[PDB]
Design a protein around this ligand. Structure first.
Ligand SMILES: [Mg+2]
Ligand SMILES: [Mg+2]
Ligand SMILES: [Mg+2]
Ligand SMILES: [Mg+2]
Ligand SMILES: [Mg+2]
Ligand SMILES: [Mg+2]
Ligand SMILES: [Mg+2]
Ligand SMILES: [Mg+2]
Ligand SMILES: [Mg+2]
Ligand SMILES: [Mg+2]
Ligand SMILES: [Mg+2]
Ligand SMILES: [Mg+2]
Ligand SMILES: [Mg+2]
Ligand SMILES: [Mg+2]
Ligand SMILES: [Mg+2]
Ligand SMILES: [Mg+2]
Ligand SMILES: [Mg+2]
Ligand SMILES: [Mg+2]
Ligand SMILES: [Mg+2]
Ligand SMILES: [Mg+2]
Ligand SMILES: [Mg+2]
Ligand SMILES: [Mg+2]
Ligand SMILES: [Mg+2]
Ligand SMILES: [Mg+2]
Ligand SMILES: [Mg+2]
Ligand SMILES: [Mg+2]
Ligand SMILES: [Mg+2]
Ligand SMILES: [Mg+2]
Ligand SMILES: [Mg+2]
Ligand SMILES: [Mg+2]
Ligand SMILES: [Mg+2]
Ligand SMILES: [Mg+2]
Ligand SMILES: [Mg+2]
Ligand SMILES: [Mg+2]
Ligand SMILES: [Mg+2]
Ligand SMILES: [Mg+2]
Ligand SMILES: [Mg+2]
Ligand SMILES: [Mg+2]
Ligand SMILES: [Mg+2]
Ligand SMILES: [Mg+2]
Ligand SMILES: [Mg+2]
Ligand SMILES: [Mg+2]
Ligand SMILES: [Mg+2]
Ligand SMILES: [Mg+2]
Ligand SMILES: [Mg+2]
Lengths: 117, 64, 201, 144
RNA sequence: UAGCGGCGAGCGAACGGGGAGCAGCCCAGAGCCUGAAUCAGUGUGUGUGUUAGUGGAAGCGUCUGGAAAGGCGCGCGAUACAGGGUGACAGCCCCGUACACAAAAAUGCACAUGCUGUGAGCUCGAUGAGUAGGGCGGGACACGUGGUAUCCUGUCUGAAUAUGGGGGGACCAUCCUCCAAGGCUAAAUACUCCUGACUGACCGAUAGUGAACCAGUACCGUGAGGGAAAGGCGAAAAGAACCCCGGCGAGGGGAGUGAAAAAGAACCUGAAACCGUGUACGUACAAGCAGUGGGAGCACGCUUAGGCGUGUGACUGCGUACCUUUUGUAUAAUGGGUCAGCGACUUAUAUUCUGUAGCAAGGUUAACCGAAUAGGGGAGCCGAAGGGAAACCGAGUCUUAACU
């Protein structure tokens, strides 16, 4: 039979070398390096789908803590106020309101202070 | 080619009805005046091959 | 089991276990595979490292040099070396049991009946050995791709059918399942039915 | 029903292992062999009954008995085999003609196994007690 | 299997059965009838081959296209639709094929017969001596000296001889069977340097012969010996007249041929590594597997501006390659310069298990025949009964005097 495997091995290498576009040096030219770099990129992508959800929550928290201290209350007070006022607004939306609508954030702060007092 | 039988195991083992193998006991060939007669009397009759060593016997006796 | 005839429009009584058996597909597939394996010639070979023309001398010494260890230029990892598992001429023929072969023929002849791929006539002769006469007769029968089983040896029919690739002519003894499947229509002489029923009980 | 509509039965054809063709196949680099043994080596393995250097079972145990040449030329006969002869008489030459005992056989017993439904004269053969009762009940006549 | 066997590893019959194929004769000696069968040789005649060869059917139109054998119509041949070539895929263009024939000459094989030689048949006899056997030492027999038959003989010996002798697995007796010490003999069987025809779920230029090519060459070795690499323009050379730069160069630009010259001989298709030119973006206060997640800006396209794409990627969170071997490797443990191509659990026969299919207390044939993947063939094998070392007994059997 003598299966000649040039076509298959070429398309299998070109599948990797297309994924390795933009990489420096032999990481975009050489199959042994590129395949070794694509697997690591999939590992990092699997990891950073988890770390995206951490890093944005951290950003949102730091923006709420800043706008709340601008209105004269800490973050942990303000979240405890919104829990005691039962306000179930997540802190993506709190960071968005804290940026674009500072009046509504002030009203949320006054609800939280009245929930603590 | 055919498998060749291990001729010592063919001289030492016999297949029974359900596929088990009978065999003679050891320790009954010499040095017999110091052994109790109870021991010898429980060594004269043939015993069955145990489950552990039944695989090596079947490997040695492919033609039953 | 009754087979109506095409030309004289009579009937013919046959065995229902022969011409009305249910189709055992796995049996028929086993027999058709064994037939196509029996046709298989199996004439090939490659050379091993034993059979490659060369010398059994080490191309370089074992150690000291910086190269990889090597013992033979006939090595199957070298260029123009041996094949690792080089082939031999082997026989691809399979055993088919006799009752399985007859079960397959009784299955596919029952299926040709149920698919109306079976035509029964009393006689099918051509006067002179001419393919023009045979193609005219098959056009009058509205047949192109056909197997023609005759319980006799008709030489003019063999000669008039030898050049047509759509048409094959067999004796009733020389029938095979892969042809009975590979042809679109099958025309049987009533004598060929009697002989097939005798062979197939 | 054409050649491109046939298909085998389910579970008839199994694919078969192909060792050393990737991680996903399961049979990866080692191919069911583990690592760095004698068993993993090409042609490696020990012979039958080898227990290490321990004395194997077929030599720990003693030989016994001998082989009777007469047993190879003796045979046992069912009662169901008595109808397969012709003439209603059963000899050695009749059973050998019926291809039951074989040519080199010189002695045969009839054993209560199966059942007979016809009177059969038995001549020159041993008969067990239950076969004697079944033959004589069916009309037979055991003689010599 | 029986056996052989440090009774280990392993070696491994025969009897008997089924088949292919079959063929028997002569001298040890005289006569009687005498040339009578057969065989060899050599002629002749006929037939059949072989070694050159001959005939050999049947198609046009139109469209695309460089070119028709292609597409679409309409016909015709076929004992020829095997195959190959022809400017793309041809039953009908060519060579062939089916079929039909053909040899001055040489030669094979059959018969028939001529000639030469050969003896045929009948009767009465004869019946292979340093031989069989033995002792010693070895070898062959499946049989390793074992209780070892049988066969061979280097050595030493050494019979009887038809009223006799050999064998029947130590040996003796009885019985059966055969006649050594002289020879000849076809077939079935084994192989392929070579020739012809055909075939391939064989290769298709790192494959297949080492060798598709001036290859057992170049080359290496004192020598025996070792032993490569290297295929493809196009349908057809129509293989580039002529002009120009240049050294009366190389090389190139035109022109020309051609369907095509990014088919120009360093010639089909021309991938990758590798090396360049151009454009966009980023980059000279910035530290590490070089990415990933976020993400500004810039450039470019689309668009009903809706805003999406694409390229780049300032800054920023996290983040020490792969393989192997290991208790455990970023490891400063191994391996890999890179690319492309090749490169490793197969095959045969036995055996067991599972699945699946067929028949079912039965199932199945091998050899072989057969024109033949059919059918026949049931030698045989496995199973339906086991126990016991065995004789033997038998749904029981063994143990034991006998089993509660
Ligand atoms: Mg190949
Ligand atoms: Mg690139
Ligand atoms: Mg003892
Ligand atoms: Mg040497
Ligand atoms: Mg090779
Ligand atoms: Mg080569
Ligand atoms: Mg057969
Ligand atoms: Mg390893
Ligand atoms: Mg280990
Ligand atoms: Mg291991
Ligand atoms: Mg090896
Ligand atoms: Mg030890
Ligand atoms: Mg001609
Ligand atoms: Mg012609
Ligand atoms: Mg073309
Ligand atoms: Mg003599
Ligand atoms: Mg002698
Ligand atoms: Mg002797
Ligand atoms: Mg000797
Ligand atoms: Mg002597
Ligand atoms: Mg002798
Ligand atoms: Mg004897
Ligand atoms: Mg002789
Ligand atoms: Mg090539
Ligand atoms: Mg080559
Ligand atoms: Mg020039
Ligand atoms: Mg080139
Ligand atoms: Mg071309
Ligand atoms: Mg090119
Ligand atoms: Mg390129
Ligand atoms: Mg800058
Ligand atoms: Mg800067
Ligand atoms: Mg490694
Ligand atoms: Mg270590
Ligand atoms: Mg480990
Ligand atoms: Mg260590
Ligand atoms: Mg670590
Ligand atoms: Mg380092
Ligand atoms: Mg390292
Ligand atoms: Mg090491
Ligand atoms: Mg290295
Ligand atoms: Mg590669
Ligand atoms: Mg198996
Ligand atoms: Mg099965
Ligand atoms: Mg009992």
């Amino acid at each position: 039979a003598r299966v000649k495997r040039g076509v298959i091995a070429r398309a299998r290498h070109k599948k990797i070398l297309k994924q390795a576009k933009g990489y420096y040096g032999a990481r975009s030219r050489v199959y042994r390096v590129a395949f070794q770099a694509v697997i690591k990129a999939g590992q990092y992508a699997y990891r950073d789908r988890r770390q995206r959800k951490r890093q944005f929550r951290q950003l949102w928290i730091a923006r709420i803590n800043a706008a709340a201290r601008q209105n004269g209350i800490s973050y942990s007070k303000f979240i405890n106020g919104l829990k005691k006022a039962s306000v179930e607004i997540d802190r993506k939306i709190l960071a968005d309101i804290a940026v674009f609508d500072k009046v509504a954030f002030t009203a949320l702060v006054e609800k939280a202070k009245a929930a603590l007092a | 080619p055919k498998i060749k039988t291990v001729r010592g195991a063919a001289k030492r083992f016999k297949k029974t009805g359900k596929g088990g193998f009978k065999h003679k006991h050891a320790n009954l060939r010499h040095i017999l005046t110091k052994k109790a007669t109870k021991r010898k009397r429980h060594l004269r009759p043939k015993a069955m091959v145990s489950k552990g060593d039944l695989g090596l016997v079947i490997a040695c006796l492919p033609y039953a | 089991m009754e087979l109506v005839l095409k030309d004289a429009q009579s009937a013919l009584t046959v065995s229902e276990t022969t011409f009305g058996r249910d189709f055992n597909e796995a049996l028929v597939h086993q027999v058709v595979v064994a037939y196509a394996a029996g046709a298989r010639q199996g004439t090939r070979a490659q050379k091993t490292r034993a059979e490659v023309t060369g010398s059994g001398k080490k191309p370089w010494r074992q150690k000291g040099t910086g190269r990889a260890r090597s013992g033979s230029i006939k090595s199957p990892i070298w260029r123009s070396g041996g094949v690792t598992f080089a082939a031999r001429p082997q026989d691809h023929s399979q055993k088919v049991n006799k009752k399985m072969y007859r079960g397959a023929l009784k299955s596919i002849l029952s299926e040709l009946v149920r698919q109306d791929r079976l035509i029964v006539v009393e006689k099918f002769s051509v006067e002179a050995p001419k393919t023009k006469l045979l193609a005219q007769k098959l056009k009058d029968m509205a047949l192109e791709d056909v197997l023609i089983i005759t319980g006799e040896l008709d030489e003019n029919l063999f000669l008039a059918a030898r050049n047509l690739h759509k048409v094959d002519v067999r004796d009733a003894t020389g029938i095979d399942p892969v042809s009975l499947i590979a042809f679109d229509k099958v025309v049987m002489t009533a004598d060929a039915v009697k002989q097939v029923e005798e062979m197939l009980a | 029903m054409r050649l491109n509509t046939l298909s085998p039965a389910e579970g008839s054809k199994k694919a078969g292992k192909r060792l050393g063709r990737g991680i996903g196949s399961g049979l990866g680099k080692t191919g069911g062999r583990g690592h760095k043994g004698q068993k993993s080596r090409s042609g490696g393995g020990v012979r039958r009954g080898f227990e290490g250097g321990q004395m194997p079972l077929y030599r720990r145990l003693p030989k016994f008995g001998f082989t009777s040449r007469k047993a190879a030329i003796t045979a046992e006969i069912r009662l169901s085999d008595l109808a397969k002869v012709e003439g209603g008489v059963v000899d050695l030459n009749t059973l050998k003609a019926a291809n039951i005992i074989g040519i080199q056989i010189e002695f045969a017993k009839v054993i209560l196994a199966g059942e007979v439904t016809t009177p059969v004269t038995v001549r020159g053969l041993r008969v067990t007690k239950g076969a004697r009762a079944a033959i004589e009940a069916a009309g037979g006549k055991i003689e010599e």
